[PDB]
């Protein structure tokens, strides 16, 4: 419906440049200030912000005056439309008499966080943006089919760089990630990391605010695209989002029963059929 | 109610020309026009005004240039983005594309920046932002990205419709990733100075520096300053133009008045050449004094007596003195007036048989009047008088010519040979007048003497030298004027635009500047040719050109750069060129003109602390519950 | 008696030919003479530096213009490229008419004149404006001879950087005439203005540039103008005028901007020092894409005040106006600043160049003046007096009060009837009201005693049209008409272009055709003989309607209002086959330049055409002698002959 905006200026600057400041700050996608609420601002006797327009998520307030303590001032805006993907926006103060001088801030909103979300080891970042957890076990549902389109999966679209049947040890966090240490039973592809191999210690993370569930213990079939962080050990580093496959795999019992009955056959063929051909013949 | 979508019931990206093209500068083609021609131009994507050059060059209407056409392209809906100059990789930045509504309807639009490999973006490019725009108004659409990419990703702004009013447009451009740390560069100076040993030869080492980032770029410029003095100069010269043309006149009297006449109108002649003052005398002058120069040449051969020898009267038995005097006459004007050679042959042969067993000359019957020999009754006129026939022989020898004088000059350099061992045993033996010494060093300087014998006479100069009353040494005397004149062309002779010459000179032509010029008659014979001489050999040398020879061998492998800056003519010349290279420059220079050598070397250095907001500070924070689609 | 008479350009330039007037004073109705002229004479030997051209004259056939031509090679085999000091060179005529019957001691009759390797005319462009550092510049330059034609001439081009040092040079033949070309800007190059210069290979005095800038910027989308209400301000205590500014922004694809400009005001001086008020500052939003802001005399006087500024003090200075808008919504934001706006005594300004100096004592002094706005454009039909002092021929001095309006273009022209031996001639010039522009203006007369003057009078002061024939009324004034014919030439561009003769009548009157040769500044000289005196005087004809030999016209047919990627059919016409250059800019260069450079245009061309113009002055001069050589020529009779002149300078 509604949002609140507090606004704050101030400067270190009485050694450096002198002069009034415009306060350029952009709104979240879909809010525009109300006019009434910043015309009141304006009327005021210590107002501050002597001057100010509007027109969509945009307001320029005009401060004739920058004090050493912080000077505040509030508004509101009102929301147009729902906002389609969380993110921040940007608040830019330019000097009056230099606007090469200048501060320019990130804010989020109220929820959501100030950065986007990266994944950073030593020199090297990598995007974190994404829902991470396919979260799929095929076995117990009704969409398991024995067409074989695994390997389709796998090669043509959406394609896949890195498998692994893994063993999860411990479930860690860092960061905005949790880590999941692992250790791998046996390895199906590889693009990045062509020398990876069974016993390995490795590392995948998933985003914090993710719900994915993986427990440590178990062992489960991890594919997906190749991550570009990395270990601080060395071994290269895998995080789990959109077109990663996470499946958990079944036991014999799990297998011999009717729900699954050779279906987990044409999946276990699938398996070691893809890690010995490779994708292309 | 108020918050609802037309989610993925829009145009589908497919149907959108996405616009792509944004030159600064297009169209440069030369095209050939015969009176008429039409381009089928295909414009850029770009929404700006175009302003098109023209210029028509033909062969028989020559150049014309047309009025500029202005040119504007407009899409009435559109999205405007402008990419920083350069953005950091790792570095959050705000993408700002602005949608731009001109219709007379409102206009629902869902935008999204497409996803790209090499940037990380909201959600992961695939949700999109519906918003509203409405008539005449526009509102901006910030997407905050950060880049992975190490070099350029084309990024593609997505806007999509509503299906009611397909309205769309799309944004495809290319954002510069700024390389690892930041440019950094230093500049490594060194005076030049190639004039004797200095620094000819020298070796410039690298940065040793480990804050450079060791796989960014890399670049180094060479450059170099020549400087010469920029002082307004001491020289004078110039002696009056138009006292010298008054000394042309045609000769009258026999032999001796005629060369009385004659002398001065050739040395006056080639003053004037030398010196360039015919510009500011009447034009015909020239043609007038050569004709002289003719009428003087027609004029003395009748008076030559056997094979080679003058007196004004042909009873009169041949004066040495004047056969010399003559001989120096008649051997400079060969070069404006083709005289006979032989006869000039001749003539030094004559003088040959006047030398005695040693060097020593005589004269068997002087001129009539001493105002000739400039005053010269007593003192070292033998001696005065050898130097003098060898100062005329000299300028006899370059008449030789062809196989048939071979011998001729053989005999007569065997001669002067002889002529200038004495001479420098003259001036070695003692204390001669001044005038000897003069005429005596420079007759061995004329005929080229060793050292051991020029130097000699150049010293004993400097003992016997005595100030004139301003400055050098030798109103005044017509002796001072003469002896003067000799010792200046000996100085010059012996070193070129000597820095004792320059005030021999002033003196000289402030004694030349007597109410308009000379009226004495030995003296300014030898002055005018040399005064002349000195304002050539002021303006003769000219010092030009630095030359830096650069090698060194590095990622590049074995590369070597010579620039110079000479060219014939400095205009004023600095010149730079890049030289990206190793840790190690190899110097050679050359040339001979001051100058200031540049080596700067570029490179990328450890990023270090942020700058922005040191000063100025804002902060903004917000309260609220937002309305969120896909968040999950 | 008899005369032969030379006539010549005083600077001869190499490769070009020299336009040489010969011509006979005072010859038996059947005699005739006949020579040749040269060039010649460095101090070697005294070679010719060029071929002979032969000429023929009679009584009847008593002057000839004469093409001698110039060229490199017998230039530089003769020794002009070996000369010591100054370029100097000899023209020469011979012919045996001086032994036979003026009785010199030679056949020769010449003139000193100076030389210059300068010639042709080379132009160039670049891609763009303004670079960015790590771009690539395109440029490309053009090649044209004196007669204004394509040459093929060997030429060499420089690059000169922002620091000021040679980065690039080339030496190129042109087969085509044109030289295209490009390098890049080095990614670490200071900010500031780059060079590129051309010469001909041969031309070391061929002096012709272009210039770019080089910055760091990205392409704005809308320009802001900051326009005063009249470029000046009168700090005149009387009244100071009141300040007032339309500032516009649009989009640079036409449409007006919307948004808040940010405004700061101050005081600039000649230095560059601008000290800001503290207060006063305008923010106001744009309507129409416009806002129109004022300064009060209240607000002006206090912030004058606030410095402890006086209105007695603006005498020099300017009032300092910068605007910062930023675009709302979208946020962008581009400045606007304004240095244009000097404090001013005066709303006019007289401009006394086409005054001409050394006037005829007896006949009417032409006072010719220009009104323009103090730094805008000329003033038309503004009042302006003059007040003509003419000091004491012996008698006292009286002086003459006249009054006219500015015509058109300035130009007011006042005929100041100036009496027989006039002492000196003092000129003050007021013009207009409120708050007058003034000037004055001395000269002084011939000296007494004179052979005789000779009066150019033109009728209309308008600038003739090429196509349009002048006449010029030509009175001798002063001494016995014992001639029968008085003698005229058209010199321009530095060179003789025409010479002809009209007899004497009842106010004789000679007609000058204004062809394209005579664009755009063009010089009349007339003479005639008194016993063996000369008299002479000159008159300057500016020609302001140039326009191309043939044409080059660019249009796109249609309505505009085109779309991105659509067809446009640009139309190219000219008058002949001809080699079009073109290039499509951004306009938004122009905005985004600190300092904006004007394109290639004609008037640049003519400008170019007109800096082989020897010409000083408007013309006129106490002698013969003075008016020849104040026209650019230089003379001989045999008895009055002209020195060199000190270059081009004319100091
Ligand atoms: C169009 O926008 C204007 C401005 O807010 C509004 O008054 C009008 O109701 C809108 N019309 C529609 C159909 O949304
Ligand atoms: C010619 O150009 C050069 C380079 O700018 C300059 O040094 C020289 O003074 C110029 N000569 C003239 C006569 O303008």
Request: hydrophobic share 40%; net charge neutral; glycine share 8%.
């Given at each position: 419906?509604?949002?609140?905006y ?21 709104l979240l ?36 005056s ?11 805006a ?7 993907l969380?993110?921040?926006?940007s608040?830019?103060?330019?000097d ?5 001088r ?8 109220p ?7 990266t ?20 076995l ?14 796998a090669?043509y679209?959406?394609?896949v ?31 990045k ?9 490795r590392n ?8 994915l ?16 962080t ?26 011999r ?25 | 109610?108020?918050?609802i979508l ?8 497919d ?55 202005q040119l ?13 100059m ?6 959050q ?14 206009l ?19 949700l ?44 495809s ?13 230093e500049?490594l ?6 004039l ?23 670049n180094?410029?060479v ?7 920029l ?17 042309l ?55 030559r007596?056997?094979?080679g ?25 060969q ?13 030094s042969?004559?003088?040959l048989?006047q ?24 003192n ?8 003098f026939?060898?100062?005329a ?21 065997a ?15 003692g ?23 020029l ?11 005595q ?51 000379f ?5 300014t ?16 040398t000219?010092?030009?050109?630095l ?12 590369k ?21 290279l190793g ?33 100025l500070?804002?902060?903004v924070?917000?309260?609220?519950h ?7 | 008696?008899?005369?032969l ?5 005083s ?52 002057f ?11 230039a ?10 100054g370029?100097?060179?000899?023209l020469?005529?011979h ?6 019957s ?11 004149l100076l ?10 462009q ?34 000169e ?9 080339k ?25 590129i210069?051309?010469?001909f ?46 500032i ?8 007006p ?11 600039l ?35 004058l005040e ?10 020099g ?28 005594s ?14 005829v ?5 032409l ?15 503004i ?15 009286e002086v ?28 003050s010039?007021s013009?207009?009201?409120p708050?007058?522009?003034?000037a004055?203006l ?40 014992t ?38 500044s ?5 003479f005639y003989?008194?016993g ?8 300057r004809?500016?020609?302001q309607?140039?326009?191309?030999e ?35 800019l ?13 394109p ?20 006129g ?21 002209t ?9």
């Amino acid at each position: 419906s509604r949002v609140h905006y507090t606004v704050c200026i101030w400067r270190n600057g009485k050694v450096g440049l002198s002069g009034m400041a415009i306060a350029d700050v952009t709104l979240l996608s879909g809010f525009h200030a109300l006019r009434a609420d910043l015309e009141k601002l304006t009327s005021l006797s210590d107002r501050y912000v002597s001057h100010f327009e509007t027109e969509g998520p945009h307001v320029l307030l005009y401060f004739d005056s920058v004090p050493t303590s912080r000077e505040c001032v509030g508004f509101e805006a009102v929301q147009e439309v729902p906002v389609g993907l969380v993110q921040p926006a940007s608040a830019t103060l330019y000097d009056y008499y230099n606007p090469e001088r200048r501060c320019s801030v990130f804010y989020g909103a109220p929820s959501k966080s100030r950065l986007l979300a990266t994944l950073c080891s030593a020199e090297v970042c990598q995007c974190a943006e994404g829902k991470c957890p396919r979260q799929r076990r095929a076995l117990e549902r009704g969409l398991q089919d024995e067409d074989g389109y695994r390997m389709k999966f796998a090669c043509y679209y959406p394609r896949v760089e890195y498998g692994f049947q893994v063993k999860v040890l411990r479930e860690d966090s860092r960061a905005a990630f949790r880590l999941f240490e692992t250790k791998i039973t046996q390895v199906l592809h590889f693009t990045k990391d062509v020398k990876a191999a069974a016993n390995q210690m490795r590392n995948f993370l998933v985003r914090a605010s993710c719900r994915l569930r993986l427990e440590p213990g178990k062992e489960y079939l991890i594919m997906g695209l190749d991550g570009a962080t990395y270990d601080l050990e060395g071994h290269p580093q895998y995080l789990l989002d959109s077109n990663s496959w996470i499946e958990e795999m079944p036991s014999e019992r799990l297998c011999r029963s009717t729900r699954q009955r050779a279906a987990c056959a044409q999946l276990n063929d699938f398996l070691q059929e893809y890690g010995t051909q490779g994708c292309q013949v | 109610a108020l918050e609802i979508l037309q989610e993925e019931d829009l145009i589908d990206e497919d149907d959108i020309p996405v616009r792509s093209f944004f030159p600064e500068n297009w169209l440069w083609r030369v095209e050939t026009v015969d009176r008429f021609q039409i381009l089928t131009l295909w414009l850029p994507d770009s929404l700006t005004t175009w302003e098109i050059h023209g210029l028509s060059l033909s062969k028989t209407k020559g150049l014309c240039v047309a009025t500029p056409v202005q040119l504007r392209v407009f899409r009435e809906f559109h999205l405007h983005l402008r990419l920083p100059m350069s953005v950091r990789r790792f570095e959050q930045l705000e993408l700002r594309p602005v949608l731009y509504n001109y219709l007379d309807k409102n206009l629902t639009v869902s935008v999204h920046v497409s996803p790209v490999e090499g940037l990380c973006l909201a959600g992961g490019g695939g949700l999109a932002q519906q918003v509203l725009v409405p008539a005449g108004s526009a509102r901006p659409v910030a997407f905050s990205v950060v880049p992975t990419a190490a070099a350029a990703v084309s990024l593609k702004v997505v806007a999509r419709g509503s299906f009611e009013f397909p309205v769309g447009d799309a944004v495809s451009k290319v954002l510069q990733i700024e390389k690892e740390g930041a440019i950094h560069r230093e500049e490594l100076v060194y005076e030049l100075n190639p004039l004797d040993h200095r620094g000819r030869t020298l070796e410039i080492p690298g940065n040793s520096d480990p804050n450079m980032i060791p796989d960014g770029d890399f670049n180094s410029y060479v450059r170099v300053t020549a400087s010469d003095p920029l002082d307004t100069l001491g020289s004078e010269g110039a002696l009056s133009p138009g006292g010298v043309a008054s000394l042309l006149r045609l000769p009258r009297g026999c032999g001796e008045q005629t060369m009385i006449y004659l002398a001065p109108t050739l040395a006056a002649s080639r003053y004037l050449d030398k010196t360039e003052q015919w510009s500011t005398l009447p034009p015909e002058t020239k043609d007038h004094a050569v004709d002289l120069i003719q009428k003087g040449y027609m004029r003395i051969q009748q008076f030559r007596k056997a094979d080679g020898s003058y007196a004004a009267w042909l009873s009169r038995d041949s004066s040495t003195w004047l056969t010399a005097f003559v001989l120096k006459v008649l051997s400079l004007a060969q070069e404006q007036v083709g005289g006979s050679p032989e006869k000039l042959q001749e003539t030094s042969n004559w003088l040959l048989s006047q030398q005695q067993a040693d060097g020593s000359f005589q004269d068997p019957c002087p001129v009539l009047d001493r105002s000739m020999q400039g005053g010269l009754v007593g003192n070292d006129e033998t001696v005065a008088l050898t130097a003098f026939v060898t100062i005329a022989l000299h300028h006899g020898l370059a008449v030789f010519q062809d196989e048939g004088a071979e011998p001729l000059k053989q005999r007569v350099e065997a001669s002067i040979s002889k002529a200038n061992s004495f001479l420098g045993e003259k001036a070695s033996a003692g204390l001669l007048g001044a005038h000897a010494a003069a005429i005596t060093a420079y007759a061995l300087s004329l005929t080229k003497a060793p050292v051991d014998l020029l130097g000699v006479a150049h010293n004993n100069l400097m003992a016997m030298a005595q100030e004139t009353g301003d400055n050098l040494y030798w109103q005044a005397p017509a002796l001072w004027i003469e002896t003067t004149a000799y010792a200046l062309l000996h100085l010059l002779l012996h070193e070129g635009k000597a820095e004792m010459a320059d005030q021999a000179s002033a003196w000289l032509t402030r004694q030349g500047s007597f109410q308009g010029g000379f009226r004495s008659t030995q003296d300014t014979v030898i002055a005018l040719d040399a005064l002349s001489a000195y304002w050539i050999a002021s303006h003769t040398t000219e010092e030009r050109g630095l030359n830096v020879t650069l090698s060194s061998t590095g990622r590049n492998g074995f590369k070597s750069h010579a620039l110079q800056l000479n060219n014939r003519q400095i205009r004023g010349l600095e010149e730079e060129l890049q030289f990206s290279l190793g840790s190690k420059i190899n110097v050679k220079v050359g040339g001979n003109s001051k100058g200031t050598l540049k080596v700067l070397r570029t490179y990328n250095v450890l990023d270090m602390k942020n700058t922005t907001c040191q000063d100025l500070q804002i902060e903004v924070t917000v309260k609220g519950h937002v309305e969120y689609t896909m968040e999950a | 008696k008899p005369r032969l008479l030379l006539f010549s350009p005083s600077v001869v330039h190499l490769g070009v030919p020299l336009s040489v007037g010969v011509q006979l004073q005072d010859v038996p109705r059947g005699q005739v003479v006949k020579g040749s002229v040269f060039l010649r004479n460095p101090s070697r030997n005294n070679v010719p530096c060029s071929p002979k051209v032969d000429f023929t004259l009679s009584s009847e056939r008593d002057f000839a213009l004469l093409s001698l031509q110039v060229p490199l090679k017998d230039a530089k085999s003769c020794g002009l490229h070996q000369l010591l000091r100054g370029p100097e060179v000899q023209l020469v005529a011979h012919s045996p008419w001086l032994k036979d019957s003026l009785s010199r001691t030679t056949n020769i009759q010449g003139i000193n004149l100076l030389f210059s390797s300068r010639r042709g005319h080379l132009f160039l462009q670049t891609d763009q404006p303004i670079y960015n550092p790590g771009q690539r510049v395109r440029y490309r330059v053009f090649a044209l001879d004196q007669k204004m034609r394509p040459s093929t001439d060997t030429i060499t081009v420089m690059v000169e950087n922002s620091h000021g040092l040679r980065v690039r040079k080339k030496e190129v033949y042109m087969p085509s005439s044109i030289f295209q070309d490009d390098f890049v800007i080095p990614d670490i190059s200071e900010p500031g203005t780059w060079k590129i210069s051309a010469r001909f290979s041969d031309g070391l005095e061929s002096n012709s540039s272009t210039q770019f800038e080089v910055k760091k910027y990205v392409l704005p989308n809308f320009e802001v103008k900051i326009t005063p209400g009249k470029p000046y301000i009168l700090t005149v205590p009387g009244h100071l005028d009141e300040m007032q500014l339309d500032i516009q922004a649009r989009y640079i694809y036409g449409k007006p901007v919307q948004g808040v400009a940010y405004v700061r005001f101050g005081l600039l001086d000649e230095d560059g020092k601008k000290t800001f008020f503290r207060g006063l500052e305008s923010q106001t939003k744009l309507v129409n894409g416009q806002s129109h802001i004022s300064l009060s005399k209240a607000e002006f006087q206090d912030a004058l005040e606030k410095l402890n500024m006086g209105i007695t003090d603006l005498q020099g200075l300017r009032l300092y106006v910068a605007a910062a808008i930023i675009e709302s919504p979208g946020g962008e934001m581009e400045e606007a600043e304004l240095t244009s706006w000097y404090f001013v005594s005066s709303p006019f300004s007289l401009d006394l160049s086409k005054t001409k100096r050394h006037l005829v004592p007896g006949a009417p002094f032409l006072l010719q003046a220009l009104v323009r706005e103090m730094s805008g454009s000329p003033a038309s039909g503004i009042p302006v007096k003059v007040s003509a002092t003419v000091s004491s021929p012996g008698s006292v001095p009286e002086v003459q009060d006249i009054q006219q309006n500015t015509d058109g273009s300035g130009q007011v022209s006042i005929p100041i009837i100036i009496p027989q031996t006039i002492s000196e001639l003092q000129l003050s010039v007021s013009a207009g009201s409120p708050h007058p522009a003034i000037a004055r203006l001395t000269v002084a007369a011939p000296p007494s005693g004179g052979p005789g003057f000779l009066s150019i009078e033109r009728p209309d002061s308008r600038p003739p049209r090429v196509g349009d024939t002048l006449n010029l009324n030509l009175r001798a004034v002063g001494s016995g008409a014992t001639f029968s014919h008085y003698y005229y030439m058209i010199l321009s561009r530095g060179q003789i272009v025409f010479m002809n003769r009209e007899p004497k009548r009842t106010l004789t009157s000679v007609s000058v055709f204004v062809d394209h040769h005579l664009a755009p500044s063009f010089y009349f000289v007339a003479f005639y003989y008194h016993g063996d005196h000369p008299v002479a005087n000159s008159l300057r004809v500016d020609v302001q309607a140039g326009a191309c030999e043939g044409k080059l016209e660019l249009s796109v047919d249609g309505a505009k209002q085109y779309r991105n990627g659509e067809s446009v059919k640009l139309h190219l016409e000219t008058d002949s086959l001809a080699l079009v250059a073109l290039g499509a800019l951004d306009t938004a260069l122009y905005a985004a330049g600190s300092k904006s450079h004007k394109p290639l245009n004609m008037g640049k061309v003519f400008e170019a055409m007109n800096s082989y113009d020897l010409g000083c002055g408007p013309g006129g001069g106490d002698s013969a002698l003075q008016v020849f050589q104040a026209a650019g020529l230089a003379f001989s009779d045999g008895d009055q002959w002209t020195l060199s002149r000190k270059r081009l300078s004319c100091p």
